[PDB]
């Protein structure tokens, strides 16, 4: 019995066996097989996390050599650090609950053998991504989770938008993959290794300019997968994949990988201030940008994907404050939250006979679906950091730490993060109002046929409601202590502001996000029922503004017409005007015309005369004349006879 190996081997069994034996076992068997095997993986890693609180003594396993070359070795090495077990328990919990959930949500779909297979390989390459013990195994899992995201978003190959959406997702992630290959080449150049242990032992000695270059490249990678503003479209362009897929890819996992890259490199992020600065301001941008999209969009899955990427900015702000236990704790609780959000959303999309996604056409469903209501309201109250739930403990202390930090400029992002929190209320109130409380918008027959979902849909929502209530109070001592030795990362002694941040808060700045996140929530509710004209004005100017914030702060357009389409035109310029146009004029298509003209001239040189004898007899004369005159010119100066011969060639060949 080996705990470190069965975390690896059991989701490999759960992936290889659905493909190799899917025709032989059938869907009814492979459902329960892939389910129970991820269940026992998840139980083994809870028991290992229980062991690891006893002694902080991680276990690694060693394998054969990937490559030995001169100054560089790469081994397959697998090590569950405290950071690794933190991410691991979250992703295995969300995975196993989504397996149980998608048993019942996919029972009418044909191809759920391939579906449960791909869910399991997504979990498996996530496992290898988390538990790897150099930068190489991190890269292997990092690429193959993007490969799975191709294979998962495009699950209905018949649908055109699903194929183009998986294309968009993979090519954004591959942009980030290219910058991580740049950063990884500089890693193996400067340190001569890829192992975390050797790089972190010598990170403080290395020059700062190199360090800025490396962490810039690795942050552009992390910014691509963890969905900040530079390429942020592909999350909400990944709603063409189904609901349990989007419960994996957005709640914990594919999102969490980009944060994991910075949480690993935290030990080599300390010694540069410039990178952490830029990290902080990108995250502070996308809290605001994603909240302002989520207010004004209207599809349910889009609003929960934007609700996801509003808090990725919050974790990125916690990175920029040099506070990695905060970002890790928020990354932990956020997974349980969003997974309950996506699965409550899929339960109300599944329950409508229309299976529509427009919140404008849901209408009141409070008395018809009380269970999905109580789930989604536990999730929304945790989502707004209403106290006594773990969103309070994950989320409000980051807003506290923006004011508590030593540097002056951090005060500004307080308000920005603060503004997002108020924004975090309002759209959530919309996706609690217009689908449960409002007057009905749908036709009457779906209100006849609205019923409760199966037991396979109910039980993961129950379990993750309990987790999203109790997880922060249980694990707060681990990640937010007065002094904690759990996560082995090493903050510089001045970037550490956690004793400073808890005490320097005035009563107003701490009391203020609590009370206003309460008040604005009740405000949006009570203004949605009684008046409903403030939100339904028809000013021409507010409709242009609303249509800006609707269409993703026009970002997709600014991505598509000015980068994608211009790129395709300039690639069409090369493939025609350069590749087939001008390289053939110096190539085989211009030489044919040159030789055609020159041969036509030198063949028609002896054309004109009726008599061959007089022509050849006058052609013998010109040469022994002309050669003799050339040699007269030639012994005097050789420079004045070169143009004469160029002109004789011009007249002979043209």
């Amino acid at each position: 019995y080996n705990a470190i190996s069965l975390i690896i081997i059991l989701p490999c069994i759960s992936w290889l066996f659905p493909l190799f034996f899917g025709r032989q076992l059938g869907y009814v068997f492979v459902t329960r097989m892939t389910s129970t095997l991820i269940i026992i993986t998840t139980l083994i890693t809870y028991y290992y996390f229980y062991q690891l609180l006893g002694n902080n003594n991680p276990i690694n396993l060693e394998l054969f050599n990937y490559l030995n070359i001169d100054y560089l070795d790469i081994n397959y090495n697998f090590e569950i650090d405290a950071l690794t077990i933190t991410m691991l328990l979250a992703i295995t919990t969300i995975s196993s609950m989504v397996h149980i959930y998608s048993i019942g949500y996919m029972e009418t779909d044909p191809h759920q053998v391939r579906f449960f297979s791909l869910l399991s390989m997504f979990t498996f390459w996530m496992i290898i991504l988390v538990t790897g013990s150099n930068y190489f195994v991190l890269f292997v899992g990092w690429e193959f989770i993007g490969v799975t995201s191709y294979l998962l978003i495009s699950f209905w190959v018949t649908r055109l938008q699903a194929m183009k959406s998986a294309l968009s997702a993979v090519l954004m992630n591959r942009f980030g993959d290219a910058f991580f290959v740049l950063g990884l080449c500089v890693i193996a150049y400067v340190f001569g290794t890829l192992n975390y242990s050797t790089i972190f032992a010598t990170a403080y000695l290395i020059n700062t300019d190199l360090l800025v270059l490396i962490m810039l490249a690795l942050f552009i990678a992390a910014m691509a997968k963890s969905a900040q503003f530079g390429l942020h479209n592909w999350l909400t362009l990944a709603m063409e994949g189904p609901t349990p897929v989007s419960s994996l890819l957005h709640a914990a996992t594919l999102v969490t990988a980009g944060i994991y890259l910075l949480l690993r490199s935290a030990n080599i992020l300390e010694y540069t201030p410039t990178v952490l600065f830029i990290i902080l301001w990108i995250g502070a941008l996308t809290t605001l940008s994603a909240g302002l999209i989520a207010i004004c969009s209207n599809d349910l899955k889009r609003i929960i994907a934007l609700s996801t990427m509003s808090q990725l900015g919050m974790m990125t702000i916690a990175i920029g404050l040099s506070a990695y236990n905060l970002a890790l704790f928020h990354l932990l609780g956020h997974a349980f939250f969003k997974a309950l959000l996506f699965m409550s959303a899929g339960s109300i999309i599944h329950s409508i006979l229309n299976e529509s996604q427009d919140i404008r056409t849901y209408g009141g469903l409070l008395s018809y679906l009380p269970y999905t209501y109580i789930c989604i309201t536990i999730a929304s109250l945790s989502l707004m950091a209403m106290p006594g739930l773990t969103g309070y403990y994950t989320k409000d202390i980051i807003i506290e730490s923006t004011y508590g930090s030593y540097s002056i400029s951090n005060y500004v992002v307080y308000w920005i993060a603060y503004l997002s929190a108020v924004l975090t209320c309002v759209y959530s109130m919309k996706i609690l109002y217009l689908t449960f409380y409002s007057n009905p918008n749908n036709n009457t027959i779906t209100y006849y046929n609205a019923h409760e979902s199966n037991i396979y849909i109910t039980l993961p929502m129950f379990i993750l409601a309990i987790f999203a209530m109790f997880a922060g109070w249980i694990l707060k001592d681990i990640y937010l202590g007065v002094g904690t030795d759990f996560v082995g990362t090493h903050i510089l002694p001045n970037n550490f502001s956690y004793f400073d941040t808890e005490f320097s808060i005035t009563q107003f700045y701490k009391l203020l996000p609590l009370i206003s996140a309460i008040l604005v929530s009740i405000l949006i509710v009570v203004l949605n029922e009684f008046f409903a004209i403030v939100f339904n004005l028809n000013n021409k100017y507010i409709n242009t503004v609303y249509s800006i914030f609707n269409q993703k702060l026009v970002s997709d357009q600014i991505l598509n017409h000015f980068i994608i389409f211009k790129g395709l035109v300039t690639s069409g310029n090369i493939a025609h005007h350069v590749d087939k146009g001008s390289l053939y004029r110096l190539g085989p298509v211009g030489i044919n015309r040159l030789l055609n003209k020159a041969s036509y001239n030198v063949i028609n040189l002896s054309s004109n005369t009726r008599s061959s004898l007089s022509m050849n007899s006058m052609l013998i004369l010109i040469t022994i004349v002309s050669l003799l005159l050339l040699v007269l010119v030639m012994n005097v100066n050789f420079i004045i006879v070169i143009p004469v011969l160029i002109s004789i060639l011009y007249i002979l060949f043209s």
């Binding site: 080996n2 069965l6 081997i9 076992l25 059938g26 009814v28 003594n57 053998v113 000695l205």
Partner: protein, 83 residues
Amino acid sequence: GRYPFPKDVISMTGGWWANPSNWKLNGLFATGIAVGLALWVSTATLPYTRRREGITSESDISKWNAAAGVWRERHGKISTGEA
């Protein structure tokens, strides 16, 4: 839905609604292979695992630092912040 499909095509992951008649019988074989493979690979990678901290005794690490200091003295190499 249950729209009709062509049965001539054979895919390894099953086809559209793959449900063979002997799926309990084949499930017995698949549980056998999965349990045997998991137990065998878990026992095979047992000696390749090790604890992180406390593998070698601290006197060795202090001696290694001493030999590092000797090799650094022989070459006359300055520290990083000495300038």
